[PDB]
Design a protein around this ligand. Sequence first.
Ligand SMILES: CCCCCCCCCCCCCCCCCC(=O)OC[C@H](COP(=O)(O)OC[C@H](N)C(=O)O)OC(=O)CCCCCCCCCCCCCCCCC
Ligand SMILES: CCCCCCCCCCCCCCCCC[C@@H](O)O[C@H](CO[C@H](O)CCCCCCCCCCCCCCC)COP(=O)(O)OCC[N+](C)(C)C
Ligand SMILES: CCCCCCCCCCCCCCCCC[C@@H](O)O[C@H](CO[C@H](O)CCCCCCCCCCCCCCC)COP(=O)(O)OCC[N+](C)(C)C
Ligand SMILES: CCCCCCCC/C=C\CCCCCCCC(=O)O[C@H](COC(=O)CCCCCCC/C=C/CCCCCCCC)COP(=O)(O)OCCN
Lengths: 48, 48, 567, 192
Amino acid sequence: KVSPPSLGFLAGYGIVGLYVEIVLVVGKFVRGFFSEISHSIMFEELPC
Amino acid sequence: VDRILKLCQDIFLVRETRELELEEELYAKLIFLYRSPETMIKWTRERE
Amino acid sequence: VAVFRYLFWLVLVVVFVAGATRISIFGLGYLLACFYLLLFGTTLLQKDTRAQLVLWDCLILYNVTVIISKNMLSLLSCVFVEQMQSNFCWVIQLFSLVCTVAGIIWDSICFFFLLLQRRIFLSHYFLHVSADLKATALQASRGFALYNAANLKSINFHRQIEEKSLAQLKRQMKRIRAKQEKYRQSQASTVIHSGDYFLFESDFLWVLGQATVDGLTRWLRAFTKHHRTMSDVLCAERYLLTQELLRRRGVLDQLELLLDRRLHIPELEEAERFEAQQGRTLRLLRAGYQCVAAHSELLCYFIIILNHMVTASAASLVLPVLVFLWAMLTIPRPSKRFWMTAIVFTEVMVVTKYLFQFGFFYIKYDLVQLMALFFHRSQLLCYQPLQRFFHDILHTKYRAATDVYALMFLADIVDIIIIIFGFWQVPQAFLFMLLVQFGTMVIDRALYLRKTVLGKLAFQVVLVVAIHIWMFFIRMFSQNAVAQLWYFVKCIYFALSAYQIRCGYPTRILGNFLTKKYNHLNLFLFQGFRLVPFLVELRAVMDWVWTDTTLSLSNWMCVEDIYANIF
Amino acid sequence: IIKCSRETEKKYPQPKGQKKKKIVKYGMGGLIILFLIAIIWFPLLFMSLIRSVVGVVNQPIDVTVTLKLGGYEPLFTMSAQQPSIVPFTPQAYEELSQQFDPYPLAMQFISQYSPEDIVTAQIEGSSGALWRISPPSRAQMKQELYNGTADITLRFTWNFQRDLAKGGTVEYTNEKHTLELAPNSTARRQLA
Ligand SMILES: CCCCCCCCCCCCCCCCCC(=O)OC[C@H](COP(=O)(O)OC[C@H](N)C(=O)O)OC(=O)CCCCCCCCCCCCCCCCC
Ligand SMILES: CCCCCCCCCCCCCCCCC[C@@H](O)O[C@H](CO[C@H](O)CCCCCCCCCCCCCCC)COP(=O)(O)OCC[N+](C)(C)C
Ligand SMILES: CCCCCCCCCCCCCCCCC[C@@H](O)O[C@H](CO[C@H](O)CCCCCCCCCCCCCCC)COP(=O)(O)OCC[N+](C)(C)C
Ligand SMILES: CCCCCCCC/C=C\CCCCCCCC(=O)O[C@H](COC(=O)CCCCCCC/C=C/CCCCCCCC)COP(=O)(O)OCCN
């Protein structure tokens, strides 16, 4: 047969890597966005 | 931190008994506590 | 005791194996005899010696007839080339007429075992053993009453514990209501924005192995303690009855709860001392045998799923499904109806396998099921709208009602680890089964958070039937071996879930489990849980989604983060 | 933004009655959860699909064989073109299967390479061209073959030329088969 060489950096070493970095960075961004929001309440609980 | 732990546990238990008419009051007390560092210092002294 | 009491089951096994080993249609008699004797052995041993002697004489007559038939059939076997070759092939497959030159060793071995057991039947040892079996048959109702007393006492204890817990909850609730109303009166002289300081008023190497095995056998004894106690009291009672039996319940009062207050018999004390003397090398194996006898039921489930899992994916899979829906949901006793249906299914399947094994138109795995089911049935030794009636029984809310939720979550997590490791098309289906597993996680959390039970039953039945019919799409031994372990983990998850269904979701089940004690281990596990991405925020969002509250999403997240930090 | 939030709260003031925005709840959490399920499912899906490949067979359009002796000249060389290249029909594939049915390795090796993946060239043995030989070369051939007790070897080689529309990376794959002969032996004698 013939298979396209687009596989290149296949899973286990290359593309799986790139995936794991991007998932860690997005997870850290979301966790910082959702968890850190306690310190600022002095600036949002403003009634008037 | 015993007072605040008791407060949060009270929030959770008043939640688990489906009396929603105290959850707002308890949350208001907690948010006011975290709205002013002077009170949290006043609220976290050491027992004798 | 081994020779005079545990040999009849062995000869039954020998008859079965001889019938199975020979494929020709002469071991069909061996299989039918094995089934009949395995069913009727208990009632057979209690009858009068003449009956058994005649029956086993009939059996040995069958044995000699079959061996003589094979001997005379060897003649046509060795004249097969002229006539029987390429003619009457159905009969040559039926009788399996083949020359020798030995090959009938099993039949002679069974004949020998038959004569040996007949000689055992003649002995007086079998006479008093039959007396002992009669006593054991008699004491069944007393054992049943003892078991009922034990379980009712346990249920009452659990009820009282739950009652005191609810009393404490009511006391806490009164306290918090009193505090809030006192604050209201103090302030008498949206609402979330409200809040003021007035709420804050201050008002040498062998010993290592021997000790380890001693610890193991002590753990086994601890696991078996209840069975040990009831077996000991029942056996002491039976011993005194048979000592009394020369030729009502009042005679049993020579001495309900697990009470040892009674007189003593020196023979039993000496026997206990002697079995303590023999703890050098058989202690661990005796403890293991006592454990498998005391439980005697979950290993039936073990064998049933191993046989359904080991190469019998074609037609065995129906029978575990019944288990998951019938044995372990109805009543703490799956009972006689389930056991008879399962065993008749196994017997019919093995006889169909034997008939379809011939050329006119397996045994190793199933014989284990047969012996296990018969052994468990012997151990028990006590006995259209009905479907809707049983469904109603499934929703009564009268059980111990305990909740164990971390267990199936951990089982699902281990299943995810197995599915991830199951790579080094099945890999293509791995993605779909992974996603549906995540969906099952979400929906079982949904079901749990609302304390629903009937929805849990519907989820259980649909999930098990789907995951079992999914084996129509199931290298086979090398690569397709992680999948069977994954299915076994699904089984343990199903067992936990259906046990939870039987229990029934106790009230006051909320909060973070890991935050039960403020120890170092709980801290470390809590941080480890917080270190896995896309779990804690999802768990907060989902708990907020299914629970009934008042705070907008951000307020819920704030409270959860606050609780975690202060914890 | 805080003031605008306060004003929109004033516009529709929800009562003390709790009900926590049930339906809106079901919407918002739903969107959130799908997004969370969405993102991670994508680079797995994209991870897997980018790895899926169709087993498109590459059948060589042309084949060439040559038979050369010594380092002097090719004695013979054929090239079966289209009609001498028979791809196996499925039926030929089963035929190859039963012929090598007892042997398990043969069955797995055939089971991998589909009938379209295995072809046969009907090289025309006798349909040659003139084998020109420079007479110097011929004479030295004969003299060495007759008295030269050296070792002379063939250079028999096969090349497969691929479709080049069906890809195939290098499309002139070939292997050489050089096997030494025996002097003072009837093989060299009959060749001479
Ligand atoms: C690597 C794994 C290995 C596993 C090995 C497993 C075990 C293998 C060996 C098993 C051998 C079993 C032999 C059983 C023989 C039974 C004989 C038997 O029951 O005879 C009974 C005899 C004959 O009747 P009787 O009393 O004269 O009757 C007249 C009248 N009633 C009377 O009072 O007279 O009456 C009697 O009173 C005679 C009693 C004879 C008792 C003989 C018992 C032998 C037991 C041997 C056990 C061996 C275990 C080995 C374990 C090895 C483990 C590694
Ligand atoms: C595909 C072509 C072939 C199909 C073949 C289908 C064959 C179906 C045969 C079904 C036989 C069912 C036998 C059931 C035996 C039950 C025995 C009984 O003892 O069990 C009771 C329990 O019975 C169970 O509840 C019955 C459950 C029935 C469930 C039926 C599910 C059917 C699903 C069909 C799905 C089909 C999908 C499509 C398939 C192609 C125990 O009750 P118990 O504890 O003593 O009650 C205590 C109170 N007492 C003292 C008064 C008695
Ligand atoms: C790493 C951990 C260590 C384990 C590693 C694996 C080791 C595997 C070892 C396997 C152990 C096998 C245990 C065998 C248990 C046999 C039980 C059988 O004999 O039960 C009989 C009863 O069986 C039932 O009647 C059904 C028929 C079953 C027939 C089984 C025959 C077994 C023959 C064993 C032969 C062993 C040969 C070994 C050769 C080396 C007798 O019971 P009975 O005295 O009525 O009991 C009355 C009271 N009850 C009912 C409450 C128990
Ligand atoms: C290839 C590796 C993938 C990662 C493997 C990690 C292996 C770790 C092995 C053990 C982890 C077990 C610990 C977590 C178990 C928590 C058990 C539990 O209590 O369950 C709930 C479960 O938590 C949730 O409800 C949220 C999770 C459920 C939704 C699942 C989302 C989909 C699954 C994601 C798996 C992860 C995906 C990448 C892999 C990382 C982790 C597997 C949380 O506690 P509560 O219910 O508060 O306790 C109540 C006590 N009565």
